[PDB]
Amino acid sequence: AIKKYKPTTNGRRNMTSSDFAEITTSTPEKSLLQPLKNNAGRNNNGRITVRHQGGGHKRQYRVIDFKRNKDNVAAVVKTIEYDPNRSANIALVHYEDGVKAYILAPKGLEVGMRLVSGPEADIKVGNALPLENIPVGTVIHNIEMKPGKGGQLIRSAGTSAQVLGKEGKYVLIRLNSGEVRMILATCRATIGSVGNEQHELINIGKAGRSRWMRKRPTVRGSVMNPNDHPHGGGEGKTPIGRKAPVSPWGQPAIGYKTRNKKAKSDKLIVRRRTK
Amino acid sequence: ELLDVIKRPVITEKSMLAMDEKKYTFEVDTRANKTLVKQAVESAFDVKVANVNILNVRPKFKRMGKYAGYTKKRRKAIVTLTEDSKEIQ
Amino acid sequence: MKRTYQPNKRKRQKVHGFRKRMSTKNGRRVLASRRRKGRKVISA
RNA sequence: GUAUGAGUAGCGAAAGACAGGUGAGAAUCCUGUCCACCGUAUGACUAAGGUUUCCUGGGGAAGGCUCGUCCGCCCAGGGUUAGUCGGGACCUAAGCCGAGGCCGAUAGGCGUAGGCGAUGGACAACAGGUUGAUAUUCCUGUACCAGUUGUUUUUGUUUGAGCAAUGGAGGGACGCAGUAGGCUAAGGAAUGCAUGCGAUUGGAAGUGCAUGUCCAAGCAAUGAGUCUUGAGUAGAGUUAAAUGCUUUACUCUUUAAGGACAAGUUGUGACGGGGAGCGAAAUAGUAGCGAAGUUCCUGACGUCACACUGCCAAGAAAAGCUUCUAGUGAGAAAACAACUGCCCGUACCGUAAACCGACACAGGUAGUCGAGGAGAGUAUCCUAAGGUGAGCGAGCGAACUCUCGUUAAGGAACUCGGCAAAAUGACCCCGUAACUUCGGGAGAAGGGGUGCUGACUUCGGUCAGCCGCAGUGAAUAGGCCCAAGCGACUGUUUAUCAAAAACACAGGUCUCUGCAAAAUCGUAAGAUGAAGUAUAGGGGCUGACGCCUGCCCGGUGCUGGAAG
């Protein structure tokens, strides 16, 4: 659930965090870990491209299947773990051959389920099915864009989808943010919404907890001198003197729809609603 | 080429005291192993192993005539023996 | 307080060395521009 | 080049005095005695950095803020020894170069394989002695690692003898916080050896003064303890294979047993070297001779050891090592003896007069050790081991300036302003308001006790007595209360005039963005975003929390539209 700390100091008045009452062990496996850096938003050239990065804790990858290309072999899932990378949890997997890997953990997976992955596999939680063998109205994740990449669509915590219906080609899918498009008939999926629901329900509280997560403070626009931001200058507190408030490069903030106007996907998208 | 191994013996206050325990202080040219000096001494004096020790020297200043110049590098060699002597020096 | 010219031996020859002035086409300009005067110390 | 200022300012924080030396010449050099300063450092060891400043013997023209027989200065000679220490012939992180390659007016930019790169991993020696300077380097004794030559007991290359992969796998392999338990070091106190008995009243012992009160690596034996369940049957997998490794089902088994690690102890080493003190044989406290090795008390974040519990911010790689097969394939593999083991650094200073500041400069410099009496303590006062007495003085004791100590009577009248000073301050005990987000305010305010001797006492203190003006008698150690604006808060800011009412901040709200995502650096290749995927990611504004966030779409921007 959600903790509420009793208010003792000033920097503990409003803190909240999860119980972590869903996680069984506290040790990963050796063979599924790979290192990382903190790029701090810096290139090959080593300049700050994306602002406000760098200066937190240490991490390692947990190499996670998005493909699920073994079929007709039952998989035993034992332990649920924690990611520093992802809002959602992971799970160990014991194939009967003796092959291990990590897999994203949806809601309702218990310790000791068995998940089947072929194109003939049934309809429960955690099964791997291509987007032809799925009936209308289910709730689906790891929707693949291209056939053979593994998942790229909806991955993070507490999100969902539906299949609104089929065509002969392609499949209609309601994603999150209300919108619908056309995804092929050779794309894998997993039946069921992803796990943790509660990552909107946490107060970071301190500043130093938001710097435990790898962030850095964002100075307002109107306080900069007039050569670091176009809102700047002015003696006293000033209103936005320029029409249509501006990012520090150009490109007004509130209003510019900025896709590529000649995008290839425009044939396949229906009801571009909430962006 | 082992007659350009050894140049000179050193005649100092410690070097005469090395003579009492069959130890001898020679100057060996640069880039020479311990093993060349063993082979050269056994070639030139019919004595044995009981291993060599090898130093180096950093140079100095001197001044003569408003001029400033170094001196050479060196390399000593303190060779010990087992059974023979050198009443040669 | 701390002042500037705090010397090392790795930095004064992995910045101002010779093997970093025969590795560009500007270190070569520097070496060839110093040899016109006839300077003794060419680099470090 | 030379004046004036002018023989003026200054001579860069600190305690010296005398006797005797040497010498043409002495406060400033040598020696002796007493006094004084630091003693979590002005004491010891090393990493950078410096580059001969180190030692021996001479010298006094210049340097030394004075003098100088002296010196970190000048001349001459002379000193740095390694199979085991730190680095190379071993491995990899950040990063850099990058055969081919992909882009680009030239120049060139980026990058796979392969590499280079310690601040990290892995790795075989300990104690003492010795010189004017070197010592895990020389010698003395006892070891260890990897090899080579003669001896040592076994033959198809099938392996039943071996070796054995650049492949199969295990292992190396890791955070923060908190107290608990065991050993050793170091520490303290006494009735164990040594010498001598006070010349100021008194003191043979005991109830006495000064001084010393031990030992290695390695090899044998053991072990306070700590961690971990083990076995079988039937199949999947490990690019071919495997007795190795992994894994699914079934049957048992469990404080049991098997296994793994372990600070430390006892012998040996060791008839050894160490030592209070004696002391020559020349001119040396030199050579040479050595007595004790006890018990109790306190006792470590040093070691077991990241061992254990807890928590979320979820805590490096590759090699060395170990097995199994692939394979190669006269017959090597224990004991004994004798030999071999390469290159670079090693002097010195190293909280400084030898480094960084133009200086022999009141500043800065990473790591380890860091004693005693009080004491929570590395605080504070005085001291041990040790090291210094500061590189201008002698007189006199006026003005004035600076740094200190005291004051009658009054106690903010001074002043822009109680600025500066004065006052409180240690431990124990009694007691403690409005207000509130129920945690606080709170060390709220305001009061009381402290020294020495005796008895009682389980524990804790009580009772009696004694002295002074004053009993945490020295040094260290919060002034308080009532109201009000501003900002919620701890934080951050103009190195060198501004530390705040400024910025950040948790929270709120709007907007963009379906993945070759928007955005950014670049001409592009490429890269960041991100090995992330709308509970995510970028952009603008407001800045905990409580109550709220009215009216206007005519104008300007944004978004949608299709007829003209």
Numbering used by the authors:
A (entry chain C): 2 to 276
B (entry chain U): 2 to 90
C (entry chain 4): 1 to 44
Tell me, in the authors' exact words, what the paper reports.
Ribosomes are the ribonucleoprotein machines responsible for protein synthesis. In the analysis of the E. faecalis 70S ribosome structure determined by cryo-electron microscopy (cryo-EM) to a global resolution of 2.8 Å, we find that structural differences are located predominantly in peripheral regions, while the organization of the functional centres and antibiotic binding sites remains conserved. The cryo-EM structure of E. faecalis 70S ribosome presented here revealed that the architecture of functional centres and subunit interfaces remain conserved when compared with E. coli and S. aureus.
In addition, we used focused classification of the 30S subunit to identify five 70S conformations. The 30S head domain is significantly rotated in four of the five classes (15.5° to 19.7°) resulting in 70S conformations with large rotation of 30S body and head domains. In classes 1, 4, and 5, nucleotide A1913 in helix 69 establishes extensive contacts with the decoding centre in the small subunit. In our E. faecalis structures, the molecular map for the flexible linker region and the C-terminal domain is well defined in the unrotated head conformation in class 4 as well as in the rotated conformation in class 5. The superposition of both structures confirms that the C-terminal domain retains the same interactions with the 30S head domain in both conformations. We found in the E. faecalis structure that contacts between the bL31 C-terminal domain and the 30S head are maintained through a considerable range of head rotation consistent with a function in stabilizing subunit association.
